[PDB]
Design a protein around this nucleic acid. Structure first.
Ligand code: ET9
Ligand SMILES: OC[C@H]1O[C@@](CO)(O[C@H]2O[C@H](CO)[C@@H](O)[C@H](O)[C@H]2O)[C@@H](O)[C@@H]1O
Ligand code: MG
Lengths: 407, 551
DNA sequence: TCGCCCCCCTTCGGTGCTTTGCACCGAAGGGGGGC
């Protein structure tokens, strides 16, 4: 019973037309049970094929909350949706979030279902539930309310969210709240138990009008390391020179003329070559240029974030986040702790959620990922491990590791 | 009939079609006048006049019955101007996805599209004029009041209508399985035959109130049921008979037909192969070009012919048992698989033979096969099977720890069915003590076409070969080829080509490139090879010297 | 002389790279099958 906010696509762009991929039995059953109730409650309506748009649908379970959560992959719809920096409905990002001891993520997407969506925009939200062995044609719905996963919903609901949170933030001025899509990121410098208690006060505050625990305090940077030995092969020095030559695209004033000269001639790779005093000075020089962060690298909010990941083995994953090439805003090392150690695709899917989560905390948005995996291998399995209510942009790269740069 | 109409639009800024009708005859347009008089009496079509400015041509073909005719209108022009639709048919039901049912019925709706009304505002665009007599006089004109056969919106709007009509019966009868494919209804239940038939009568009556007849001619009550190109027996299912062309002289188009039939056969006939027959299609230039069968293609064809003469059947799905998928390697990037739950009782078979990428290996293609089967299993049964794979656990372990991209296979157990999938060589992680060290380099001139490949070694050996009609990347591969050719069973190679290192490090065992194939063959014969990279033009080590020389 | 759907095999053409050809990938040609 609210006036709708008029919404448009970007000029010269049509709505999404993305095919539904196959779903397992239990995801299909969960979706039909979820969508039947949503239909009864008027949140979605059954539509026909004269609607030419579609967006893929699937479902996830977070391991702590074992009820299914419907997830519509509105990435295509969001790229074509008008920006809301123009209607002054965008959300600023608080720089204090990343300096908190603990940050808890809450899924508040259900709040959107109380605000209707522009009559003329709902056709762009259509999705299709598949059927096992194609017993029936797909079943089609569209939204009548602000959907979960649509970039417009936090923008339109924002004035409402501010009002609901104003008392809590008033009473807790040192707690930091940042909304990103369907999520609230809740940071505090408080001991673990009392943090969780104010989390629950938060919760009941929300429930009244209408938890996954981070420690950014303990994210670290993993710089480039140069091996340390006392005897050095020709092969070691070749490996060392190629690494430093690459790092000179990133760091300033890194030299290889002293180490390179040690390799005059055509030598056996296993020949041990003693280091001249000068070469030892050049390497100690290089070593501590790599010690400390690069000078001249600043976040630009008008450019996209990009993330690269390299598989390093034994469950270790290195990553860099940047906007311009070789100007890394962050370099890191993800390591999983599940002990099972068996699944590359699961580890990479979890590495992606963690990296994207860090970017949300730090900069307020997720990066576009360059994924070290075949397209078809990622697409066979990734939804089995996804636990976020958002989905980042990604693309698939096959880049062999020339130097083992980041490990 | 009393269904609510589905509103439809032309694409923005577009008008309706304005073409002309064809070959204009006494026989043809008196047959035309007869054809439509009964449709008009049914209300399916209405006479129109010249203030309707649109037109489209019409024709007819024979039905599967093959005394009946099928009215068709060449709506190609109208279709391009009609709004797009989101198609609700997402796939094709498969008999291996059916569970055993106590009582089964197959029904079909009569004159299905003609029972669904067309948007009143859109009808004027379906105009077809049937001329007067061989273009003497003004001409007879009709428009559709119902879904036309040939219009791109018709199948979607029919399916959507059929779904709405069935919905009350489905929710009311959730223990009755109804496969709905276009106007074809498979109905299975675990009720006794007498109750089953009572539920069918109810369903037929419900369809009839909504204007969908179910004529007795297409009402199947007894096995074997003819369904979706198959025969459904109580315990098993067969494909309807596949007849392969038996030409003495083969055109390209003949070969294309044959490969298609074999692919269709491969869903239940194990071990079908089409690589050699498909090879004959490459580089050809006309569908009527005669193509002589190679010896390999004749052998492949004879092998499949043997397979096809044996009768086969699939069984039905039992949800309380596991799905199992077993894969065998057939050579030249061909794979074949069977899916079963009890041994020697296949639900279905299949094959994977796609060549993805210029350079690859058997482990990657096995991984691809696994992914194809995983996708199809989810489509058909809603879950992934357990895999039986002809690859050792050590081999797989060796692969996913060295290979830099993330990769994975779900729960699988080794099955010893040679030939097994294996890595054919593995690059050393450290330089080999006592092995010669080759510094290789190749360069080509972009304009020239001309290049050089050569090496320089720590044992004083050196060599340069001139190359014509080459590229920069080829001379680098060529340089590596040369070192492998001239070196012992253990060798250390240092290149400045990220490109060449990239291909070789992925351990390919096959390639569309003859040069890369030769390198692979050389790598397989070596005992140990360490391959290292250095940046070019940095005056490094032996790299500078070999660089020196190919200039 | 038609429509819509799935599948496979081949060919073509757009994209982006610290490239100058190469690898990747989507679309469209042919075929099979369904209604
Ligand atoms: C699936 C379809 C319905 C049921 O297919 P159907 O074989 O049962 O035909 P229908 O029920 O009408 O007559 P019936 O009384 O003998 O059952 C038909 O309406 C129309 C559609 N269809 C089928 N084939 C063709 C075709 O080639 N070209 C076109 N444009 N459309 C076709
Ligand atoms: O993985 C790419 C694959 O996913 C689809 C959805 O089926 O596209 C999604 O992912 C892309 C990569 O970020 C987005 O650009 C796109 O908007 C989103 O729908 C397929 O389109 C694509 O093949
Ligand atoms: Mg029919």
């Amino acid at each position: 019973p609210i006036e709708t906010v008029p919404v448009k696509l970007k000029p010269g762009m049509d709505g999404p037309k993305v095919k539904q991929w196959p779903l397992t039995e239990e995801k299909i059953k969960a979706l039909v049970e979820i969508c039947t109730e949503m239909e009864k409650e008027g949140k979605i309506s059954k539509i026909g094929p004269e609607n030419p748009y579609n967006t893929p649908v699937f479902a996830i379970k977070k391991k702590d909350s074992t009820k299914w959560r419907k997830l519509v992959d509105f990435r295509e719809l969001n790229k074509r949706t008008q920006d809301f920096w123009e209607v002054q409905l965008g959300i600023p990002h608080p720089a204090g979030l990343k300096q908190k001891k603990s940050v808890t993520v809450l899924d508040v997407g259900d709040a959107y279902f109380s605000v209707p969506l522009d009559k003329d925009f709902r056709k762009y939200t259509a999705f299709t539930i598949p059927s096992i062995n194609n017993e029936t044609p797909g079943i089609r719905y569209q939204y009548n309310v602000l959907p979960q996963g649509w970039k417009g919903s936090p923008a339109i609901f924002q004035s409402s969210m501010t009002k609901i949170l104003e008392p809590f933030r008033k009473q807790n001025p040192d707690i930091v709240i940042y909304q990103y899509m369907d999520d609230l990121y809740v940071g505090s410098d408080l001991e673990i138990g009392q943090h969780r208690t104010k989390i629950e006060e938060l919760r009941q505050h929300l429930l009244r009008w209408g938890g996954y625990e981070l420690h950014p305090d303990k994210w670290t940077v993993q710089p480039i390391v140069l091996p340390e030995k006392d005897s050095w092969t020709v092969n070691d020095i070749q490996k060392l020179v190629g690494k430093l030559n690459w790092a000179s695209q990133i760091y300033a004033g890194i030299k290889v003329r002293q180490l390179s000269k040690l390799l005059r001639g055509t030598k056996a790779l296993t020949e041990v070559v003693p280091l001249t005093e000068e070469a030892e000075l050049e390497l100690a020089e290089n070593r501590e240029i790599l010690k400390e962060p690069v000078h001249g690298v600043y976040y630009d909010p008008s450019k996209d974030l990009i993330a690269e990941i390299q598989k390093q083995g034994q469950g270790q994953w290195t990553y860099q986040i940047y906007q311009e090439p070789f100007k890394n805003l962050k370099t890191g090392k993800y390591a999983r702790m599940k002990g099972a150690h068996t699944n590359d695709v699961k580890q990479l899917t979890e590495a992606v959620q963690k990296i994207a989560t860090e970017s949300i905390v730090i900069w307020g948005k997720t990066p576009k990922f360059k994924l070290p995996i075949q397209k078809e291998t990622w697409e066979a399995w990734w939804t089995e491990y996804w636990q976020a209510t958002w989905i980042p942009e990604w693309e698939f790269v096959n880049t062999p590791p020339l130097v083992k740069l980041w490990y | 009939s009393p269904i609510e109409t589905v509103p439809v639009k032309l694409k923005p800024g577009m008008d309706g079609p304005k073409v002309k009708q064809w070959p204009l005859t006494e026989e043809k347009i008196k047959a035309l006048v007869e054809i439509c008089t009964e449709m008009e009496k049914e209300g399916k079509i209405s006479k129109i006049g010249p203030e309707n400015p649109y037109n489209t041509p019409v024709f007819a073909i024979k039905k599967k019955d093959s005394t009946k005719w099928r009215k068709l209108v060449d709506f190609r022009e109208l279709n391009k101007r009609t709004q797009d639709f989101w198609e609700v048919q997402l796939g094709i039901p498969h008999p291996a996805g059916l569970k055993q049912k106590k009582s089964v019925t197959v029904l079909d709706v009569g004159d299905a599209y003609f029972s669904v009304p067309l948007d009143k505002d859109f009808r004027k665009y379906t105009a077809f004029t049937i001329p007067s007599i061989n273009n003497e006089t003004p001409g007879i004109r009709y428009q559709y009041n119902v879904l036309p056969m040939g219009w791109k919106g018709s199948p979607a709007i029919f399916q959507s209508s059929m779904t709405k009509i069935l919905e009350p019966f489905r929710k009311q009868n959730p223990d009755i399985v109804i496969y709905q494919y276009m106007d074809d209804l498979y109905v299975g239940s675990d009720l006794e035959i007498g109750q089953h038939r009572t539920k069918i009568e109810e369903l037929r009556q419900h369809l009839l109130r909504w204007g969908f007849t179910t004529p007795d001619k297409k009402h199947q009550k007894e096995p074997p049921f003819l369904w979706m190109g198959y025969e459904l027996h109580p315990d098993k299912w067969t494909v309807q008979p596949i007849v392969l062309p038996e030409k003495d002289s083969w055109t390209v188009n003949d070969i294309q037909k044959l490969v298609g039939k074999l692919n269709w056969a491969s869903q239940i006939y194990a071990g079908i192969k089409v690589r050699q027959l498909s090879k004959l299609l490459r580089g050809t230039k006309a569908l009527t070009e005669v193509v002589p069968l190679t010896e390999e293609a004749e052998l492949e064809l004879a092998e499949n012919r043997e397979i096809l003469k044996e009768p086969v059947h699939g069984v039905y799905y039992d949800p309380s048992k596991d799905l199992i998928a077993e894969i065998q390697k057939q050579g030249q990037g061909q794979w074949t698989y069977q899916i079963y739950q009890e041994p020697f009782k296949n639900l279905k078979t299949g094959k994977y033979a796609r060549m993805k990428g210029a350079h690859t290996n058997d482990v990657k293609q096995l991984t691809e096969a696994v992914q194809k089967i995983a996708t199809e299993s989810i489509v058909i049964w809603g879950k992934t099977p357990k895999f039986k794979l002809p690859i050792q656990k050590e081999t797989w372990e060796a692969w996913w720890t060295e290979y830099w991209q993330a990769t994975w296979i779900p729960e699988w157990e080794f099955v010893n069915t040679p030939p097994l999938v294996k890595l054919w060589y593995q690059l050393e992680k450290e330089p080999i003590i006592g092995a010669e060290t080759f510094y290789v380099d190749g360069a080509a001139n972009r304009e020239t076409k001309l290049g050089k490949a050569g090496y320089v070694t720590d044992r004083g050996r050196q060599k340069v070969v001139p190359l014509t009609d080459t590229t920069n990347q080829k001379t680098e591969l060529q340089a590596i080829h040369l070192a492998l050719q001239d070196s012992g069973l253990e060798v250390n190679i240092v290149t400045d080509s990220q490109y060449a290192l990239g291909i070789i490090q992925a351990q390919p065992d096959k390639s569309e490139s003859e040069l890369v194939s030769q390198i692979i063959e050389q790598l397989i014969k070596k005992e140990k090879v360490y391959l290292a990279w250095v940046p070019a033009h940095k005056g490094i080590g032996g790299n500078e010297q070999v660089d020196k020389l190919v200039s």
